[PDB]
Amino acid sequence: SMPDYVAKYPVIQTDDEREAYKAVFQDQFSEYKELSAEVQAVLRKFDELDAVMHEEFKKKKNDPTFLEKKERCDYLKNKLSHIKQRIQEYDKV
């Protein structure tokens, strides 16, 4: 098994497909930007705490909610990257 975007975003063949992938990239990038910034901020907040040096903060780091948030963020970086790769390949042609 592979991520869902692999199947949903096959090799571009038409100019319309290229524009559709662009629309999807623009939408998902704004979502990704926001999410990643938030995730990094938290990770950094702890980074500042680490520099200062607690247990509650370690738990916060392993919070399942945030942990889930971090995994969605990784999915998004991967999805966007794949779509970008697709567009570029067509663009080179």
- Cβ neighbors of 31 (< 8 A, separation 6 or more) are 76
Report how this structure was experimentally obtained: X-ray
Q: In whole angstroms, how far apart are CA 5 and each of 15, 53, 62?
A: 19, 42, 28
Q: What is the resolution of this structure in A?
A: 2.9
Domain that residue 42 falls in: 1-93
Number of domains in the chain: 1
Those residues with Cβ within 8 angstroms of residue 18's Cβ, 6 or more apart along the chain or in another chain: 12, 87, 90, 91
